Amino acid sequence: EEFETIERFMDCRIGRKGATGATTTIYAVEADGDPNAGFEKNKEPGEIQYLIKWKGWSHIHNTWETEETLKQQNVRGMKKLDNYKK
Amino acid sequence: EFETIERFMDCRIGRKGATGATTTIYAVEADGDPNAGFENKEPGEIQYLIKWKGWSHIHNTWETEETLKQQNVRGMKKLDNYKKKDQETKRWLKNASPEDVEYYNCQQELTDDLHKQYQIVGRIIAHSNQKSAAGYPDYYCKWQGLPYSECSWEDGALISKKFQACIDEYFSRKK
Amino acid sequence: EEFETIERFMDCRIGRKGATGATTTIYAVEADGDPNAGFEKKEPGEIQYLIKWKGWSHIHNTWETEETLKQQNVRGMKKLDNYKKKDQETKRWLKNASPEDVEYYNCQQELTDDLHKQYQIVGRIIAHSNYPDYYCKWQGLPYSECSWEDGALISKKFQACIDEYFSRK
After folding, report:
1. Which of A42, B130, C69, C132 could make a disulfide contact with C74, Cβ separation 3.0–4.6 Å?
2. In the CATH hierarchy, which fold is given to the domain comprising C98-169?
3. Is there a contact between A38 and B128 if contact means CB atoms under 8 Å apart?
């Protein structure tokens, strides 16, 4: 395909399950609202998500993701994932 | 699931039964103050204004030692400390020149206004992706007089009642 | 078996290791100097938090680390988790905040920091004990926040306030 590539892990967080992907961009969040709104351990949906900086895209395109979503999209560079974990 | 008393904001004598959830600044604005004709002529009941843990000042409610207990709230020790501190102050103002009473009243008025501002939205910073059945998103609010670490998410139906202007400006600052 | 407990987190900063605790009180600083004097990059860093202690007036706030808190058994630790969460949250939002929004943020935080600075300044002295201790009305705070303080300590900086006090007796 036209495989996306994870360039760098910028941040990490425990967030509302489902608050990942395109809806988490800074522009989608300022236009449609944040899908992680007032989350916290009070409920789950509750997963570990990583802020991803993509190859060939400025920081405004950074999105929160999970191993699940990452693997689903078959992104290149998975190596830095378990490298970030540790 | 048991509320916690974070701080005692004020004290008053008011109508019996004028306490909890119908005494919030917004419950009053929507349905009227249950303490509405209280001035002399109807005997009182000492009540305390409470700032609850995890809830912003707009959710402050008046309560009595009794309603506090009935709701099994946490932080009851603060009520005891508050009562003891109040008596100390009342006493240390034993004579106290009119100059001291004058200073006291002036200062107490500055802080009272201060506290009222904790209830007004100074700026909306964000909103939620999910909307209520009524079509309202929640809003991340910055309160007047408090640092950003005091911002909190609020039901849209709620602040729209009084702060529709902050909401309108928030969306306008973006396209 | 005395234990101190965290009332509120006032601020956070990166500071020279060890520049935490008792010697970081505004009065210990004025007295002997600030253990974080001209810290840089130059040497090991460390995230420190300025905390307001329950049962103590603001003049007693000290800087601390997530480590010194636990070594001392400080209670209220759960408030440290929320604060961090919140700070990463606003430091986050700040990354893409617009120029207009960022400036509003700086002005408000300036105002806020001014207000907090007042809490450590005596606005009046309304009673002494039978150096005597003094009941201090703190600048910017309600009378419900007055507190007894060691006279030797408040006299060092607010001597004028104890004289206005005694001139009215």
Report:
1. C69
2. OB fold (Dihydrolipoamide Acetyltransferase, E2P) (2.40.50)
3. yes
